[model samples]
Target: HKSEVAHRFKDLGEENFKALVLIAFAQYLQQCPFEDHVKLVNEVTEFAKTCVADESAENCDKSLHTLFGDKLCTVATLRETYGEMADCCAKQEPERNECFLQHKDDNPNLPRLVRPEVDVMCTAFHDNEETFLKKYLYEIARRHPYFYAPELLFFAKRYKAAFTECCQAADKAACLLPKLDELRDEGKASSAKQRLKCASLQKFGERAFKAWAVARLSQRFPKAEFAEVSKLVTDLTKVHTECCHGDLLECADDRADLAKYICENQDSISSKLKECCEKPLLEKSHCIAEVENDEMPADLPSLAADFVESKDVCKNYAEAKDVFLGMFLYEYARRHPDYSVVLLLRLAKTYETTLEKCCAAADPHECYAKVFDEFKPLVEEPQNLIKQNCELFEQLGEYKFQNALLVRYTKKVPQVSTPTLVEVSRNLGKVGSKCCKHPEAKRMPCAEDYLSVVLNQLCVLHEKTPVSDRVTKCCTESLVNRRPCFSALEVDETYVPKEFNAETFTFHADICTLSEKERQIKKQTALVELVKHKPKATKEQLKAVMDDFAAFVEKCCKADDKETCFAEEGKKLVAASQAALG
Candidate 1:
C-alpha cells in the first residue's frame, strides 16, 4: 500500500519529521473506523499542502493543530515533548524532516524510562480502567513509534483482552500474569526472528535471501499454492530489502502489509495455513513464524532432489555450490513439512560437509554412492520419545530439568555465551510449566511444540554449532533416522565458564521502581549476568542472593532515609554475593 501522505513527505524530503505525523495519522486511523482512513489521510494531505506552501512554518503548526488538535495523545503529546520542533520547523523543507528525525527519539524534558510492571499496570487498571487503558494506548504508541498503526492496535487489543477478564477474576495473577508473559515471549521471539532475517538479507544479498524466503515461507504454509506463496515472498522481501537497512517505518509498513496479505488471501491458504491468519493483524506474522508444517514423509533415497547418484554428485557441487546445497534443503524441506528452518539449514550443511569429504577422495563417485559411517543417519525409535522426555522432566522438576539441558549445551557448545545459555534454560523451564500439566491426549503436541521452539532458538543462536555430538551426527543424517541419533548422545554435566566475575550480581534501585515487569526483567538479567560471571554459582545459592537483594530493596525503598538505607544495605548485598560465590 502506497501511503500518499508518506510519499509526499519523502518527495519533499520532509519524511523525518512528517513521518512522525504519518505515525500520528496511523494511530488516529487505528482508533477510527476503517471507512474514515481515506478521509483522514486526505485531510492530512491537504494539511501537508498547507505546510509546504508556507516556508515560514506557519501552516506546519496550523496543519497539525487543525488535523490533530482534537486527538492530542497521538500527535500533540509528541509535539509537546518536542516543544513543537521550533528550530526544526524554521528550517527549509528537506532539513525540517531531517531535524525532527534526529530529535524524535531524544530525551528532552520528561519520560518514563520503562513501563510499570504488569502487576502495577493491573492495579492501575483496577483503580481506573478506562483512563489506564487510554494511557496504555498512548504509552505503547509512543514507545513503538515506528510500529504500523494496525500492529500497535493489536498490542492494545492484547492489553485490553488481558485486562478484561483478569480484572474481575478472583485470582487476577493467575489469569493476567501468564497471559502477559506469553505475549511477551511471543513478542520477543518475533524481533529475534526479524533481526535474523534482516541479517540474512544483508549477508545473503537479495537473490539468496529471496530464494530462502520462498523456501522458508512455502514450508511455513505447505498447503498454499506456490502462486500464492511466491507472490507473498516477492512482496514481503521487497520490504525487507530496504527496511533491513534500518528504516523503521518500512519495517512497520511491511509487517502491516503482511497482515493484510494474510487477511486478504484466506481461501488460497489451508485451514492449517489460515490458523494464524484469523488472529489479530500483527500477531499473524508471529503465529505464522511459529507454525510447524504438517503431514510430512521423508524416506527419500537421495538426500537432495537432483544430485541423485554418487558419481555425478561431485559434479553438481563443484559447478554451483549454493544452489546444489540449497536444492538439497529445498527438496528435503518440501518433502518433510514438519522440519524447522534451522534443521533444514543443518541438514543442508551436513550434506555439503559430506559431499566435500567425498569429493576429496581418490574415487569420488564411489565414495559419494555409499553412505559411510559418518554419513549414516540415526535409526528409528520404537515409540514417541516426547512421552519419555516429558516423564523425565516432570519427575526432575523444572529447575533440575532445564538446568541439565543447560549443562549439556554448555559442555557441548562451549563457544556460546553464558547469558544466552541462561536465557535458553529458562525458556526450557517454560516448556514444563506449560506442557507438564497438560492433559494426556494433547500433552505430547503441546510439549513437543514448546520444546521445538526452544531447540530451534538454541540451534540458531549456535548457528554453525550443533547442540551436541548426537545432534551433529544426526543432523547430517536424514529426518527419520536423525531421531535415534539424537536420542543416543550422552548428556555431559561437566562444563564451566571460561571467564568469571564475582561482582556481576549488583542491582540498581530500579528493582525498587515497583514494576514487576521491569523488575522481573532486571531480575532475569541479573540472574543471567551473575551466572555468566560466576559459573560456579549454584541456582540455589544464586537464588538466595537474589532474594537478599530483593529484600534489601524492599527494606530500603520503603524506609525513611532512602540513601542511608541502601548505603548500609548495599554492603550487605555485596557480601551476600561473596558468600554465594564461596
Candidate 2:
C-alpha cells in the first residue's frame, strides 16, 4: 500500500483525517504533488476539488470506494477503524476537521519507515527543496502527527537549514544525520512540554496551572508591567485552553494564532521578545521560545521561600487550599523559573501532604518541622536514583544502554522471565529517549513520572507470578529503595537457558573490504547475536570465537575455492566451537 503520512493524522483511520485534509490544502497551495493512501498519482486539482466540497467521513468512504474497491473489506472494517476517532466523527462540519486535527487518540503505532541513507536523502533534497521536503514532511508527519502543522513546519525549516549546510559539506553523513539529533531532541522536548502542560491543567486545575504560567511570563518579561505580563500569560493560558486541549486542524492554530497575536503585540511583549517577530513564522516562533529572563524584576512582593509557613498551615489550608496554593506556587515559581517544575511540584505536594498530616497532630509545629526530615529522604532518594539512571540512559547508545539494564536484571532476578525483563528494559530505554533530552528543568520530573510507570509495570508483571520468593521481596520493598534494592541484590545467576541458537555466519571475501568502523560495528553486532544465543559465554572465550571466525574468513579469501572453503571452514569452526563448549 502507498503510505501517505498525512492520512494517518485525522479521523479517516483513527488518525487525524482533518490534519491530512489540511496537509492536502497546504500541498495544493504549494503546488506539490498530491500523495494519498489510495496510491493515486493525481495532482492537487483533485485535492482542491475535495476541499471545495463539504466532505464528511461517511461521504469520504463513499468517494474512497468510487476510486478503489470493496474487495479490501466491507464498510464495517473501515468504520471500525474510523471509530477510533468516534468523537471527531460526531463533531459538526467545521468542527469535525478541527477535532480530527486535535484528535488525541490518533497515536500511529505503524512501523517506522527507514529514510534513505545520507547521500540518497541529500541528492533528492538538494535537487528540489520543497518537492522532496514535502515528501519528507508527509512521510515524517505520517508517523508523528502529534507535530501538528506549524510544528512540522518548524522542523521543515530545520531540515532545510541542515540540508543547506550539509549538502555543501565534503562529508554529508557526518554533518547531516547527526544534526538529525536536534530534531529528535527538540521533538521530544516539545512532546514532554505538551504532556506536562495538559497534566498540570488537568491535575492542578487552571488556577494553579495559570499561576505557573504567570510566574514563567513574569520571569521572561521581568521589566514589563505586571498587567502586560498578565495579558501575555493569559494568551498562553487561552492557547492551552484550545490547545492544551485541541480539536483543530491547527491547534497550531493555537500557536499560529498565538504567534501572530503575541509576536506582534508590542504592548503584550517586551522589546526583547518583540525582536523575534521579524523572522519567518517558524523561525520567529523558535526565536520567541528562546527568549529568556536575564534576572528577576524589582517591585514585586516576595512570597515565602517555604511552600507554606507550616505554623500558619492549617489556617491557610482551611481558609482555601487552592487560593493559598496558587499564591504559594506563583511566588516560588516566579522566583525560580529556571528550577525544574518536577522538583518544584514535589515541594508543593509535600507541603500539602504534610499539612494534611500535621494539622491533626497534637504538636503541629513539631510535625511540620521534623516530619519533613524523614519525608525528605523518601522524596529525594528515589528521585536521585531515577536521575542517575536517566543520566546513564542519556550517555549510553542503544546496545550498551539495554545491555547494562539487561545484565543488571539478568544478574539480580534470573528467575524472572527474560522477555519480561527485556520489556521493562525497552520501556526504560524509551523513557530515556523521550525524557533525557528534555530541557534542564523538566528532565528530572519527566524521568520521575515515566520511571515510576516502568517500575509499576515491573511490579504488576512480577507480583502475582514470582519466579523466586526474592522477586516478591524486591518489588514490595519501599518505593524509596525499590530500584536501589533491586540493584543491591546479588546476582542470582542460577537459571539455565532452555535453548541456545547455534547461529552460523558465512564468511565472504568482501570482509577484507570493510572500513575500520564498519568492521568493528558488524563484528560487535554478530558477536552480540551469538552471545544472546549462548548466554554464559565469557569475554575471553567470546573473543576467542570471533578471532577464530575472522581467521577462517582471512584464510578462505586466498583459497582456490574461496566461497566453498569459506562456507565449509566457517560452519565447522563455530559448530566445533559450540559443540565443545556445550
Candidate 3:
C-alpha cells in the first residue's frame, strides 16, 4: 500500500512526494490523549479525502488504510502506541529520549522521509539534550496549544551562557533533565518557575533571579528612579533565599494582588523599606497595613539619604550621583505640590553641573557634604518662602513638633539652652506669616495644638527653682488658652519620656557618690581617657598603663571613700603621665 501511494505520487516529483510522506507521518504521531485517539481516524480519513479530491487518485485510503486502516482499527493501534509512549515517559529527559529512540524502529509503517534531517535533530537528543529537548518541546508547543511552556523558552534564551557547558555535555539530557522533572511534577510550566529552576542549576541563583526580578519591578514602576529600581532589585534578591522555593510562579501568584496594590502605591512609597513588599505573601501582608498610616519622610533630604545609602558608591559614582540628585528633585516636587513646577524646574537647573564636578573628588564624603552644602542654601531659600504658605503649615508644623521632641529629649538641664526651641519658634513664625485663602484657618488648629504642648512643657524647665517665673514670662497668655503651667519642681528634670530613648534613662545620685565596683569602673574609664591624651604614649606603655590602671582601680580606687581614693588615683596617673612625657 505504501509502495502504491509512493508510485502514485512519484510523478509529482521527489520533493512533493517526500513532503507529503513527511506530512502524513508527522500527523499520525502527533501528541494526543488515549481517549482522543478515537477521533484521529476521522481526521486521517478527512486528509485522505482531500488528497483523493485534489488529485484524481484512485486509492484514497491506500497509504492511511495501511497505516491506520480504512475504518481504521488503525485508531486502536495508534491508541495502543500512544499508551505505550505514556507508560515509557519518565521524569528524566535522557530516559524518555532513549525510550523513543529504542522504539523508533519498532514501527516500520512510520515514514522516514528526509532521513538526514530526522537524524540531525534526533542525534542531538543524545549529545546536546537541552537543545534537543527545547526543539522538541517548542515544536510541540507550536503545533499544539496545550503543551506551551513560555518560561522554559525564556529561560533557555535569556541565560544561554548559563546552560552552555551543561547543554554541551556528553549526556545531553543532564542539564535539562532536572527541569524536565520539575515540569512533570508541577503538571504545568510558567516563566517564573522556569526562570527560578534555571537559576537553581547554577552555583548560586543570584544572577538569573536578579534578571527576572528587576524586569518584574520595572514593569510596575516604569517611571521609578533608576536608583530606586536598583535598590528594590538588591533588596528583592537579598530576600530571594527566603521567598523563592525554586517554584516561584505560585509564589508570585500568591502575591499578585499584593504586588498590584504595591504597584498602584509605588509613587506614594517614599521610604526604602523592604520588609513588606519584597517578602512572601504572609510576610508582606503582615507589614503592608503599617504602610498606609506610617508617617514616612516627605522631604527631599531624607529621601536623598535613603537613595544614596541604597547604592554601592564605589561602582557607580557619577551615575549614582545623577540618580541621587534626580530622586531628590523628583521627591521635592512630589512633597511640595503647591510649589510652582516652573520654579522647581529652575531650582533643578542650577544644580546641573554640581554632581558632575563634585563626584570627581577623591573623597566621596567631602564631595557629598559639599553637594549637600550647595543644596542647603538652594533648599532653604524655597523653604523659607514655603514656610510662609499656610498650605504648607501642616508639614512645617509636624517638622517643628518633631524637632521640639528631639530638643526636649536630647538636652539635659543646665545644657538645654533653648536654641532648638528658638529655631522651632522662628520656623513657626515663617509658617504663620502668610495666611492662605482662609486666614490660615487650617494651620490655626495645628499651631495651637503644637504650641500648647510645646510651650507648657518648655515653661517649667526654662527657669530656676520656682519655675513660675518662666511660666508667666514665656508660657502664659498665649493666643490659645490650652497652654497650662507644668510645675517645674514636680516636673522630673531627669524624667526622660518613655516614647523614645528609654534605654538611655538611668537614675543619678545627687553628689555622684559611687559603690566600690562603680568607683573601679569609673576610675578605669577616667584612667583610659587620661592615658589616651598623654603625650607620646607608646603602644607598650599604653598596655602597661592599662594593666597598672586595672591594678590601681582594684586596690585604691575601689575603696568606699571614692573621693579620697580618686584623689590618690589622680596623683598616681599624674606621675604616670609625667614619666610617659619624659
Candidate 4:
C-alpha cells in the first residue's frame, strides 16, 4: 500500500541528500532483490550528474553554505561515487540477483550489499536512483580519511550524510565536522553538554549520510543487507543514539518506512506484514522532505482503505513468483536437460533488455557468459528439445516467449548479482517444501511433502495463466476452472513425472489447439473432478487452494480479483483439457 512507505525521500522538501541516503539504506535492510531498487540509485546519480553539469550540485553547495555552512568537496566526491554505483546497476546483468546476494553476504564489511538482491531489483525498475547514491566503497574507501577498508565503511559514511545533514540544519552542516572535533579538545571552554551536542550534530549528519549512503549502496549491490541489514541498522542506530543522547533516536515509523521500502524495492516478494501493518509515527516527517512539504496528507485516514484494495496484488505477485521460482530452482537442482540452457538464455535476454533500458552498455556480450555459466549444464540437446517443443513456442506466441526469455536471462552471475532467481526459489521453497512435513535430516523428499510443493506451483500457474488472461497463455484453461489446472506441477500416486528438459520448451503447442468454449468447459470439468473424488478433501483444503490460486492469478494478471478476463469458449476447451489429469 502506497508503495510500502511512499519512498521516504519522495516527500522531502530540500532533496536532503542525507535523507535520501537514509531511504536508500532503509531499502537495503529489507534486502529486496528487484531491479527497481538497484536502478533507483542509478537514476538519482544520472540526475545528479546532469544537475552537476548544469551546476546544480554547486547550487546545492551554495545553499549548504548559505544555510548549514557545508562545503561541496566531500559532497562532490560523494556525488561522483553515487553516479558510479547507479551506473553499476544500470549496466549490470539482471540474472545476477543471486550473485548480488552472495556478494553482499561475503562483503560483510558493507551491509548494504546484502539486502535481498531481488527486492531492490524490483524497486529500481524504470526509476531514477543515481542521484541518491554516494559512491562505491571498494573504490573510494581505501584512499582517504576512512583508512579502513572503504568498502566496509562505505555504506555508513556515505549514507550517514544524507540523514545528518538536515537534522543539523543547512547552516550547521559543515559545522558538524568541527563540532565532532571539539569532543577531543579536552581543555576547551565548552561543557560536556556542549561537546555532546557537537558530537550529536556531527553524528546526525553522519547518521543521515550513513542512512542515505547505505541505501544507495544497497541499491548498487542488492545483496548488501539480506538477513543481516536489521542488525546493521541496529548497530548503526545504537551508535546514532549514543551520539545524540537519544534525543534523535530513530522512530518506529522511520524503521518501518525504511524496512518496507527495502522489501518493496526487491524484484518480487509477498509480505503479510506489509499488507496488514499500519504506518509508523515518524513517517510523516520522513515523507515531507521530498514533496517539498512539511505536513502529512490530510486524507491519510483513507489511505488504509485504499491499501486494502491493492494488498492482494502484492501478496499474489509474491505467491505466483514463488511458484515459478520453485520450478526454476528445482529444475536447476534436478539438472533438467535443456531447462538450464533455456532459462539461462532467457535470463541473458532479460538482463540485456534490463541493462539497455536502465544503464549504459557498449554491448550485451560482456555479461552474457558470466550469467550463463552460473546456470550450468545447459540444455545438452537444445536442438532436439526445440524440435519437440518448437510448435509449442509458436502457440504460446513467439513474442511472449521471447519477452519472457529476455526478462529472465540477461543477468551476469558471480557475486552480488541479481537475486530475483534466489528470491523466487526461496519463497517457493518456503511455501512448497519448507512448510511441508519432513523427516529428521534427510534430503530425499516424501510423496506428500514433494506433492505439497508441486501442487502449490501447479495451482498457482494454472490459476494465473488462463487463456483469456494472457495474450498467449502457457497452461491449460479447463484445469484452471476445475482448479485442477493449477495442480499440474503436483505429484501423486497416479502421476507420471516428466523431468524438465530445457532442450526445448515442453508442451509448447498445447495452447494453439484450444478454443475458448472448449477451454472453459474443460477447466470447469477438471475443477469439478478435482473437487469431488480428490481424496477426503476438506473444505479448508479446497479453500486454501482457492485462496492461493486467487493470489497467484492476481500477481500475474496485475488486475483486481473481480475484474479478470478470460478466453472465448471454444478456445478455452482445448486449453482446459490439457490440465485435466493433474
Q: Using TM-score, give the best candidate's number.
A: 2
Better of 1 and 3 by TM-score: 1
Each model's TM-score? 0.55, 0.58, 0.19, 0.17
Per-residue lDDT tens digits for candidate 1, residues 1-582, read: 123333335443542333244445434223333333334444666656655565344335433333343333233334444465545656654455445445444122325536566678778888887556555555444544344444445565687888888978888788887888787677655545555456556654676565666567656555565567657767877877755443444465687677677767765654564667777444676576566554433444555335545456788788887656655655555654444344445455556777888788898766655443332341112224545656778787776576555654454445456667777767877776677676654454454346545654655555575444545555455332443454565433454554544345555454676575466545555555555455666657756776787688778888886767776777777776766687
Candidate 1 residue 405 C-alpha distance from true site, Å: 6.3
Clash number for each model: 4, 12, 3, 170
Question: What digit string (tens of lDDT, one per residue) describes model 4 on residues 1-582?
Answer: 222122333333223443343343322222322333335444544434444444434332332112111211113332344333323232233322222222222122333323223234223421434422333322222122112121223234434453345334554435443443333222121123223333434634543333332332222222332234334444445443442332112333344455565445433212222322343333322232221101212332321122222333233324554333222222222222212222332333343344344333344334222444432333333333333333434454433333222222211111111232233223333322332233322212222223233333433443554322221122323211221232122223342223322222111223234664343333333233333333233445544543444443334245333223222222343334323423
Order candidates by TM-score, high to low: 2, 1, 3, 4
Candidate 3 C-alpha lDDT tens digits along 1-582: 434334334343433333233323333355433224324423544455455445445555454334322332334444465666543343234453335334332123323322133335435645875545444443333232212122333333433442444455666455554544444333322322333233343433464345444433433343455566567666555444533332222233444454555645655553433556665432353345334222324332554454334334434545555454444455544444333333344344444455455556676544554444455565454444435445444554643333332323232221233343344344344335423333322333234323433443355345343333434543443211223222122322443322212112111221145754354334333332333234234446655665675565555534677567646665666576457645
lDDT per model, in order?
A: 0.56, 0.57, 0.41, 0.31
Better of 3 and 4 by TM-score: 3
Candidate 4: worst-modelled 10 consecutive residues by lDDT: 409-418
Which 10 successive residues of model 3 have the least lDDT summed?
502-511
Q: Which of the two candidates, 2 or 3, achieves a greater lDDT against the reference?
A: 2
- Residue-level lDDT of model 2, residues 1-582, one tens digit each, is 122222322213322233344343332122222354323323222442443343442234243322222212222333455454445445554554544445433355556657678888888887887568666666565554444455666666788899999988998888987788667756655665555456557755776666666556655665555566666667777777776554333354466667787666755456676577776554565577677554555666634324433366677777987656655544555566544444455455566787788779897766676544544664565457657876787687754566566655554565666567667766677777787677755565466556655665677577667677776776775443455566567855565544554443444656657875455445544444455555676656755776787777668876786767866887798678786457
Off by over 4 Å in 2: 1-112, 181-238, 244-246, 256-286, 297-312, 334-339, 361-363, 371-406, 409-582
Model 3 ranges with Cα > 4 A deviation: 1-197, 200-204, 207-252, 255-582
